[PDB]
Design a protein around this ligand. Structure first.
Ligand SMILES: *[C@@H]1O[C@H](CO)[C@@H](O[C@@H]2O[C@H](CO)[C@@H](O[C@@H]3O[C@H](CO)[C@@H](O)[C@H](O)[C@@H]3O)[C@H](O)[C@H]2NC(C)=O)[C@H](O)[C@H]1NC(C)=O
Ligand SMILES: *[C@@H]1O[C@H](CO)[C@@H](O[C@@H]2O[C@H](CO)[C@@H](O)[C@H](O)[C@H]2NC(C)=O)[C@H](O)[C@H]1NC(C)=O
Ligand SMILES: *[C@H]1O[C@H](CO)[C@@H](O)[C@H](O)[C@@H]1O
Ligand SMILES: *[C@H]1O[C@H](CO)[C@@H](O)[C@H](O)[C@@H]1O
Ligand SMILES: *[C@H]1O[C@H](CO)[C@@H](O)[C@H](O)[C@@H]1O
Ligand SMILES: [Ca+2]
Ligand SMILES: [Ca+2]
Ligand SMILES: [Ca+2]
Ligand SMILES: [Ca+2]
Ligand SMILES: [Ca+2]
Ligand SMILES: [Ca+2]
Ligand SMILES: [Ca+2]
Ligand SMILES: [Ca+2]
Ligand SMILES: [Ca+2]
Ligand SMILES: [Ca+2]
Ligand SMILES: [Ca+2]
Ligand SMILES: [Ca+2]
Ligand SMILES: [Ca+2]
Ligand SMILES: [Ca+2]
Ligand SMILES: [Ca+2]
Ligand SMILES: [Cl-]
Ligand code: NA
Length: 646
């Protein structure tokens, strides 16, 4: 027949399986005679048959998962036989499955990826666990640690196969939590029959998507910089936040097309740092404030640009020095132009602003001009005090304009004002009065003297012409004696002067200047004094001579003594001084010192008596010399007759 038994797996060595002999009705000891034996090819290492008793034992521990591997039916087929008579028997030992194996996952560490943009209700398949046992001891269910985000959907397909699924219950946000960690378990149907459990650690990667745009913490930024800030100066460090992952979170900055081209020139913006710096010259005088239209953009797909605006206020700095500009200037200023006469006009500018653009002026020199201002920054240069061309030839006026910044800026400009001349000085003569000494009987048409004169003014106003002012001299005109060279001022004699008739005269000589508005002139006086010269000869006036060129006869008494006075000779000279001094002498007529005559007087007196002489026929006859003491010395002589009457 069919012999049947049932036994569990993993039974101990020696476990009772079944008594073949008893189930077949053959007594214990008759078995040995009949050749009770196991067919050789049907022997299994798992079963050992005791030939003496007919009882089956487990010989090697049976592992159902090793012999059948998930087969629904696990039967071991053995065969036994007896001899005389021959009897063959099939023996089926059905192996039963026990829950000695838990379910297991091929990957104990599992990772599934989900976009943070996943719609709830979406399902995400999962690794199926494997339980090598069969039937009620195989895979029974999946469990996930309780959470809000995911649930488990277990589906059975018939086929006794149970595989799992994830169910997203709520929307994910990678920006809040990008990694989720849950425990995944699978349990079998073991209910010591008890349940076994398997595990897989579950990790959700949350995928990113460009669901955030770059964000400026302000829509408008305002920064103030000083003008002339050096290129490279930090304007502002812009910042557009994007918490996304990777390129979706990388931001790049640029200028929006709204920006003015000028600001594009003057500003540079590093597209990756967002640093906005100066790349030109900030000229407050060109514009005081600039608009920078910036846009940021993330490098993810479907990128949407963000915007912002930086307003740069330029601070004014003192970088423009004042400029001076004369409207009109004149160099022609008269000396007699009263104080207040205008000489020049000018205006000042400073293209700065605020206190940097205010200008104050000073005139340099401590000179006879003042600055006057009606409207500020419009000026006049005027005369302070009266001018004197004779004291000031020209002038150099330098104006200095200086602004009210720090550092202050100053400019200077010079104009030269030439002092014009007026005929306001009268000529003066080298001397108030001159002394001219002229020889008697001089040369007519001769240079006798020279006069000088000087005038302080300029050119014509000091060009001199000389004159002899008309007067009267010896009953007629003064031009009869002297003429003046109207250019040189020379005094010339025109006639030979006779000291005896005229000896001195005086004329007022004049010098006029070439004055066009009003001629000016001065005068002086010249005294012509006349040297006397011995041109008159002396002549005797006493004693009076005879009729017709006949000597004077003065009687000497021969009866007379030494020192006896005869008479005195008097002469005359029309000259003056040593030219009319008079001395007297005798050359011939005296005999051995018989007579004597005085140097100055001309007195004849006897030196000695008349020895050896008594009224001789031939009387004595002297010759007397009258002389003056000038050069040339002139003389005149006379004859005397001394007759002897006692
Ligand atoms: C540009 O913008 C970014 C983002 O706004 C600024 O990042 C700032 O960075 C500091 C320093 O890393 C952050 O402080 C951090 O705090 C955490 C505490 O959670 C700490 O773990 C870190 O060690 C660090 O101390 C700060 O939160 C963050 N600021 C903001 C508003 O998020 C960056 O500073 C900006 N740069 C410029 C030049 O503007
Ligand atoms: C020659 O020059 C003298 C010096 O300038 C003249 O003297 C002046 O004469 C005026 C005319 O009356 C007087 O008012 C002034 O007081 C005089 N000046 C001085 C300094 O005393 C003089 O008049 C001139 N001669 C002539 C003929 O005109
Ligand atoms: C398998 O084992 C786990 C404990 O590790 C249980 O939670 C489960 O019910 C089954 O007994
Ligand atoms: C898998 O393993 C975990 C521990 O990692 C158990 O807690 C669970 O019951 C299953 O046996
Ligand atoms: C008068 O005459 C005498 C001579 O008689 C001269 O010597 C003198 O020089 C003057 O002419
Ligand atoms: Ca087993
Ligand atoms: Ca088993
Ligand atoms: Ca199992
Ligand atoms: Ca998000
Ligand atoms: Ca994102
Ligand atoms: Ca982004
Ligand atoms: Ca400037
Ligand atoms: Ca300026
Ligand atoms: Ca200035
Ligand atoms: Ca003058
Ligand atoms: Ca003058
Ligand atoms: Ca003059
Ligand atoms: Ca004479
Ligand atoms: Ca004379
Ligand atoms: Ca004489
Ligand atoms: Cl004369
Ligand atoms: Na849930």
């Amino acid at each position: 027949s069919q012999l049947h038994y049932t036994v569990q797996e993993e039974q101990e060595h020696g476990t009772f399986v079944g008594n073949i002999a008893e189930d077949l009705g053959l007594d214990i000891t008759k078995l040995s005679a009949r050749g009770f034996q196991t067919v050789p090819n049907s022997r299994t290492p798992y079963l050992d048959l005791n030939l003496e008793t007919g009882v089956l034992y487990v010989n090697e521990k049976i592992d159902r998962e090793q012999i059948c591997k998930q087969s629904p039916s696990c039967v071991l087929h053995l065969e036994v036989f007896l001899e005389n008579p021959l009897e063959l028997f099939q023996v089926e030992i059905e192996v039963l499955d026990i829950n000695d194996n838990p379910p297991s996952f091929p990957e104990p560490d599992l990772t599934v990826e989900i976009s943070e943009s996943a719609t709830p209700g979406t399902r995400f398949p999962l690794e199926s666990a494997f339980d090598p046992d069969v039937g009620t001891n195989s895979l029974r269910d999946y469990e996930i640690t309780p959470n809000s985000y995911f649930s488990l959907d277990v589906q059975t397909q018939g086929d006794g196969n149970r595989f799992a699924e994830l169910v997203l219950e709520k929307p994910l946000d990678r920006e809040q939590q990008a990694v989720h960690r849950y425990v995944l378990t699978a349990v079998d149907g073991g209910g010591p029959q008890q349940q076994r459990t398997g595990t897989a650690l579950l990790t959700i990667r949350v995928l990113d998507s460009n669901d955030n745009v770059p964000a400026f913490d302000q829509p408008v930024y305002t920064v103030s910089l000083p003008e002339n800030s050096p290129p490279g100066t930090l304007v502002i460090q812009l910042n557009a936040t994007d918490p996304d992952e990777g390129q979706n979170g990388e931001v790049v900055y640029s200028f929006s097309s709204h920006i003015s081209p000028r600001a594009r020139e003057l500003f540079g913006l590093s597209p990756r740092t967002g640093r906005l710096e100066v790349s030109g010259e900030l000229d407050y005088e060109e514009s005081p404030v600039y608009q920078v239209y910036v846009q940021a953009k993330d490098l993810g797909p479907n990128a949407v640009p963000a915007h912002c605006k930086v307003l740069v206020r330029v601070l004014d700095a003192n970088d423009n020095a004042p400029e001076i500009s004369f409207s009109t200037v004149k160099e022609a200023v008269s000396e007699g132009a009263a104080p207040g006469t205008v000489v020049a006009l000018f205006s000042v500018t400073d293209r700065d602003s605020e206190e940097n653009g205010q200008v104050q002026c000073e005139l340099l020199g401590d000179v006879p001009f003042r600055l006057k201002s009606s409207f500020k920054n419009y000026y006049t240069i005027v005369t302070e005090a009266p001018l004197d061309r004779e004291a000031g030839d020209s002038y150099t006026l330098t104006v200095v304009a200086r602004d009210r910044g720090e550092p202050a800026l100053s400019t200077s400009k010079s104009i030269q004002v030439q002092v014009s001349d007026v005929n306001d000085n009268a000529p003066r003569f080298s001397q108030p009065v001159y002394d001219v000494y002229v020889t008697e009987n001089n040369v007519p048409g001769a240079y006798i003297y020279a006069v000088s004169a000087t005038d302080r003014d300029e050119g014509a106003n000091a060009q001199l012409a000389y004159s002899i002012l008309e007067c009267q001299i010896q009953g007629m005109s003064v031009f009869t004696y002297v003429s003046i060279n109207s250019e040189n001022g020379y005094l010339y004699a025109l006639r030979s002067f006779d000291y005896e008739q005229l000896k001195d005269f005086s004329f007022q000589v004049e010098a006029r200047d070439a004055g066009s508005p009003q001629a000016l002139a001065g005068n002086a006086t010249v005294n012509i004094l006349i040297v006397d010269q011995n041109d008159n000869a002396p002549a005797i006036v006493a004693p009076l001579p005879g009729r017709n060129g006949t000597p004077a006869r003065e009687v000497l008494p021969r009866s007379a003594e030494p020192g006896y006075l005869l008479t005195r000779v008097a002469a005359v000279d029309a000259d003056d001084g040593e030219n009319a001094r008079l001395t007297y002498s005798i050359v011939r007529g005296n005999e051995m010192n018989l007579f004597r005559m005085d140097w100055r007087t001309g007195e004849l007196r006897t030196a000695r008596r008349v020895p050896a002489k008594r009224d001789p026929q031939r009387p004595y006859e002297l010759v007397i010399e009258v002389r003056d003491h000038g050069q040339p010395p002139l003389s005149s002589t006379a004859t005397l007759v001394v007759q002897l009457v006692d």
